[PDB]
Amino acid sequence: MNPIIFIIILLTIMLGTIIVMISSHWLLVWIGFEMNMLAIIPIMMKNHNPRATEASTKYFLTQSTASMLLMMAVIINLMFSGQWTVMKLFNPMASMLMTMALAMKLGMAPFHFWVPEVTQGIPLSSGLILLTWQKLAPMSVLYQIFPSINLNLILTLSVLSILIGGWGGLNQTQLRKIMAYSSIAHMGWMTAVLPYNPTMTLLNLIIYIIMTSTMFTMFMANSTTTTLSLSHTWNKTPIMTVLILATLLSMGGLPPLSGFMPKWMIIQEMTKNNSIILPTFMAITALLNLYFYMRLTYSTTLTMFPSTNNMKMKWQFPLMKKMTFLPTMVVLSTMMLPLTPMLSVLE
């Protein structure tokens, strides 16, 4: 891939997301989704190996099916309303189809099976796009149709995502599958608060993106994709292990780290609506996420695993990866709890 071609394709991925976000017409929203899927597959196939081919095919089949259900909902909405405006849907069957269509696009459980596999099959840079940028467009549509979403359906997906994400991460030794299951679990929190306060869905989304972007950027820096490969970081870049520790604890929602904020704010919103059993269940089940974050901090930062002799050759060479924005993202990933009231800007 010619560098100019990569930029144009990369700009098209953003263009499709932006089209969804600025569109007031259901057709243009669907077009934006198609444009996004068209441009992301070549990024997935960038390295041209059988695994990347499998991931791209599994991704394409899933996203195509969601687009069909989404467009079906739009046409049903047109029959029962005669209009195309992006807003609440006027038919409950259309609401179900759109909600499920967006659930597949996000990778929410039980439409989650593709997220672990696609993420594992593609490079880290592509996985970063998949688990962060690709969340924006479906969430922005959910942010506009939520008044007509069936409450039981959306909360059922949120609960299942948190459980399935929590349990799925416990068995993983690959860093890309850990980030996939962690992503599934975090998506559950975003949609659980969606019916009550959409602002806290945006807050959780932004903070999830900052923390996920930081973790992928640190994995890219040392070119690590397994738990054991990451366990050598202490012997080359000690500073990196400390940043991984702080970021991982934040992702686990431990105060006083930034990652505690979205969980804190979502519990507040749910209790204000006399929803007590669900936030309690959610917070406890999120302890599964913390458990398999803590294993990574054990093998990465708090202990020292054995090295290999050839590691000494890497002591003589500096990191040359861009690590774009890493110093800023890690500070935002960890030291933002004192600034929590700034969430009103999202209002």
Binding site: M21, I22, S23, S24, G82, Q83, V86, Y143
Partner: protein
């Protein structure tokens, strides 16, 4: 939209196609033009929570124009009865019907 860049910049990218009461080529009106306009003008500015309740009449009529469900039920009721009366030798259609 999520980001209303269209309103901010004043450009009009897709609002033109959103409703059937908007300006059409050569002013060809849609079949339910009047019903849409009434519902859009009833609910303008007051929000969906209020509009769901205070514009049911306008919406209910508009829905009838779109899918004609009440009308077709009425015709099936009339047609079904004629079958009963024609088949019983009770009513006879006039020449023009």
């Amino acid at each position: 939209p999520f980001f209303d860049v269209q309103k901010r910049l004043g450009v009009d990218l897709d609002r033109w196609m959103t409703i059937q009461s908007a300006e059409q080529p050569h002013k060809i009106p849609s079949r339910c033009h009047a019903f849409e306009k009434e519902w859009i003008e009833c609910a303008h500015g007051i929000g969906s929570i209020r509009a769901e309740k205070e514009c049911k009449i306008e919406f209910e009529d508009f829905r009838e124009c779109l899918l004609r469900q009440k009308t077709m039920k009425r015709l099936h009721a009339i047609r079904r009865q004629r079958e009963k009366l024609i088949k019983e030798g009770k009513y006879t259609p006039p020449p023009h019907h």
